[PDB]
């Protein structure tokens, strides 16, 4: 959520006057992942035990 | 410095409904909001 303000001119002349603008921006979450590979052998758990 | 009178400006915040009593005159900084759904 973010919220932004927009900054205005007092004006004049043949223009009605303009109204401030708020603008409410949301952007979802992108999730990810990333995984590696490690491999141990069978006789290091035989060792283990 | 002043620009438009910072008493005249709260008094006009005051008088249209909104009781503060301090106007902010400098900087400000708010919390970004996070939203989670589950």
Redesign the interface.
Known sequence: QFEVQQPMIARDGPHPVDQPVHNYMVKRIHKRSLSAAFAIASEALSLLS | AAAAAATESDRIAGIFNIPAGIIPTGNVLST????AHR
């Open positions: 970004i909001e996070v939203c």
